[PDB]
Design a protein around this ligand. Sequence first.
Ligand SMILES: [Ca+2]
Ligand SMILES: [Ca+2]
Lengths: 447, 447
Amino acid sequence: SKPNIVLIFADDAGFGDFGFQGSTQLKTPNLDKLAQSGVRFTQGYVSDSTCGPSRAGLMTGKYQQRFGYEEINVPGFMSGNSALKGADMGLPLDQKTMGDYLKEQGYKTAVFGKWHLGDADRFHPLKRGFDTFLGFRGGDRSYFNYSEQEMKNGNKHFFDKKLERDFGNYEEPKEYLTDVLGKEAAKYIEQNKDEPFFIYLAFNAVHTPLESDPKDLAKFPNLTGKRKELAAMTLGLDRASGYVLDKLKELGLDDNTIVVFSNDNGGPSDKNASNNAPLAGTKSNQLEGGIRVPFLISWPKHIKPGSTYDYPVSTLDLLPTFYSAAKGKALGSDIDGVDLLPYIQGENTARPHKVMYWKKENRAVIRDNDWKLIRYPDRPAELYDLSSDISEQTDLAAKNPERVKTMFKSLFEWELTLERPRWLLKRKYEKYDIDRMDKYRLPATQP
Amino acid sequence: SKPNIVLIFADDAGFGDFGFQGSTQLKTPNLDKLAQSGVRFTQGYVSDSTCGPSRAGLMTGKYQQRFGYEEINVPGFMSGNSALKGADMGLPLDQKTMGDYLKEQGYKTAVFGKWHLGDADRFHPLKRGFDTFLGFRGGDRSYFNYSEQEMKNGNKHFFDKKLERDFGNYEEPKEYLTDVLGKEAAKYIEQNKDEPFFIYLAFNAVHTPLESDPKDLAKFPNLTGKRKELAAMTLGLDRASGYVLDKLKELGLDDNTIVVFSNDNGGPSDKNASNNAPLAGTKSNQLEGGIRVPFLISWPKHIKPGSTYDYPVSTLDLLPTFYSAAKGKALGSDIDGVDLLPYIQGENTARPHKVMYWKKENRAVIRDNDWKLIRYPDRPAELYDLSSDISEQTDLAAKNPERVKTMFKSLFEWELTLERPRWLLKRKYEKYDIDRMDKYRLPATQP
Ligand SMILES: [Ca+2]
Ligand SMILES: [Ca+2]
């Protein structure tokens, strides 16, 4: 008998904007119970500090750069010189997804909400190892229904923002999208209570646009502007998550169900007032604030409740971890993630990752234990000791020239194993990413 | 009366492998007379340290990266993810060439030898402002005829290596290609002795493959291996250059003819035994050895014979210099080169370039006066003072942190004005370029 798997994946959430992450202002009671029921990771990372490359890594358990998925796939934002534009941008078809791996172990598979791994029919979830789908192909959309007007008077790329059941059944949500996503995950759990199931629950929460239940806004009278709306949407994500967690309890599935909460990248603090405290930086930079994310795994009877795990882990680990728990035997050799279960349980006391990497064009990172080397296009490479400087305020490059040179060589060694990107952003977005990094260069504070 | 213009452009030649450049072993008597007849530049640069991007800059007078021509166009060597492959790689059609500009001033225009700005019919010289053509579309070819056998049993991209008159008149040279190229330039000068003419003479010499007249090899008994063959081919380039210079004398055109000798990039010392003394580095790195080239301009009666010009100049300058000398009035505003004539003659005492840039992906350079900042993917950015360290052995980065930061920002500012590349090399060539850089990291000496 094989465990059910629920991967709850938030969008553009603050590292510091959950109760279990030390938030005073924000309220995440259901996710607080999820944290206390299992293991909270203090050093959980995504594979990129933007939506698309992150999800590509999560879905494959592979450094997404190794198959050209380097820069974010945003239809209408790519260079006129870009190899693939619009709907042709997607997860290469030769890649085997989390869905595909769990379908081979006889799981019923579903994805609710944000896909963002290609808009063209061939990149559709139901072609990528998911039996079931309710969400949108694109990167973002309204948390309420679109009018007939707005849908008819939309540009060529607006079809990816429209809510979709399975293959091309376009119907708009009747209700706040976050609540619709939660409640459809719950229906799907009840409809599949007898077989093993895998649910990728990809909330568009708390990505822009800033849109909330009026019910949620009244609960934060003290808060103001974009922060008031983040809190409302967060409470929303927490309620919708609650629907799923309660249903598992209600049906006695919680005993033999893995539940993972995480986040696709660090918070874009200037767009959605997210707060990455106590980390520097945001979405689309490779400071801890961009790449370090809230990360929970709950598995009752298997993981001790109320435990922390302090060693670095990656979203990349989730494919092999899930597959191993689903008693999987035929794991591809091209997989960069490790099975986390032996490490969580104490059977392996080693770090699950000595060396970790990030790369978007000239911006790249190598972490070797607790050394962080950051390469930029516009300034000397910086070196940080994360064992004593979680906030990256003390550049140790100057006083460690030989460690910088070695780490620079190891980072280059890893770049040589990557494909060239399959698509390129317009040049000017590199400037926006770096100006934002500089705007949020200091540690964020709670609150 | 408008002056004739002859641009003699060698391939993969050594910075140190000409008599007028201080060569011990090699013989370039015709080019030695060319140097003495005009101005030798001690700091002449190409716009990239490889064939294709270099030629793209030369032909447009523009930083070739500003229209996506960043990495070398070699059919069969591009990433499977590359936006354009094979014959579709070429100088974008929206770009106006040196040929186009001089055809508008009523010049008869011709190109002999290596084109390498696109193999497809639309990228052909006769579409890009040349009335006449005898050469090959591709990057390299044998210095002797190809058999019917070799031509029939060649890969899809071999058609670019075949010798071509005007538009698709394929006939193989009956004689050493360097001698055939020189003698056809001379025929064309005689055939057009009465009207103003422009000849781009792009010798494939001294690019691989290493192939010489047996007559030339016997003149270098003391030399051995690849060096013996370089010397023979060099003597060959010098004789073939001689045919052109003698013909101008013979017809009394020398009085009113501008002659430029230069080189498309620094010498690939490990492939053709070229020697970039006294510079560090080679082809495909951005040390002085890659980007700094022999550079002569002769205009009898107009430029003082036997003169040196010590301030940096670029191949980029040749389009506006040529155009201005052809009494051109309607120069595009997108042009990065300056007219060198006022600077050569002393009318402008200012540097013709304060700030110069190079970029191939993560490898980039900014020069500000005699400060050279070099960015690499695999090591800390280096700073050199070229006024006192022509050989780049004394890294001043650590002792000049503020200059490094500012220059890093100016270099980024210039990257933001560029398009993304229109095509990408396979990943593994970045490793080969950097291993070669390291093999030739020390100053080359005469040997
Ligand atoms: Ca996101
Ligand atoms: Ca060349």
